[PDB]
Amino acid sequence: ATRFKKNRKKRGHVSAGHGRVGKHRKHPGGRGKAGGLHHMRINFDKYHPGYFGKVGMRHLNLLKNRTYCPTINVDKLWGLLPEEKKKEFSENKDIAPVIDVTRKGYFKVLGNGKLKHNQPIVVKARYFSSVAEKKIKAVGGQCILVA
Amino acid sequence: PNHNAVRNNPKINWICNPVHKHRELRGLTSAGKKYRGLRVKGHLSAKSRPSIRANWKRRQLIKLRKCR
């Protein structure tokens, strides 16, 4: 590291890139974040607007696992299925694939994207979007609510 | 801890070990257990359970690997 440094470029140069007039001294507005709103208000407003104030109620112990949400879009739902298996479903009009999204790790299925027309599929999940549901019904698939 | 009956007795016998010199000044008594909070368990003891010293040192400690 040491051999490429800016100090190696400026080694005999007095203030050495930090201003001869200035005469370089540490934290000269005050420490850390401290000059925010007072002296650095212009910086904080222009670069970090919504910083100051108090907004919303409090939830004292959040416990993030209770409200856990692993999603997939309908767009990538078919992508959980292999190519050759998918070709077999495309070929065979008489059958549809069941997809357990939870067994593949997901709880909610959302509505971004395309389902291929005239091609039933069975989707098992805890949660589905209104749009996802509409698409599954539209393509003649089935939705399974499952725990 | 010296006398033969207590050394002989399997009950209480543990007290004969030299760590029981000044139990109250280590706070191991029921009174000591109280003010160190060792009666308290669960989330009411969260900042205190392994010891007040211990818990704080664990929380304070910054641990670095060789390759980070």
Binding site: - | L64, R65, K66, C67, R68
Partner: protein, 49 residues
């Protein structure tokens, strides 16, 4: 003052590590490279030995 805080080690990545070994073995393969590396190759009788 020097302290043991210093970042001496590095994480060298699994795929990269494997690539380096494979590519070095492939490089070791090449006869011209062996001689360039300074091995006295003249009386050797196959390209990998």
């Amino acid at each position: 003052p020097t302290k043991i805080w210093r970042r001496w080690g590095r994480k060298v990545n699994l795929k990269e590590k494997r690539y380096a070994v494979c590519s070095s073995i492939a490089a070791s393969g090449v006869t011209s490279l062996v001689l360039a590396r300074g091995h006295r190759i003249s009386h050797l009788k196959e390209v990998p030995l």
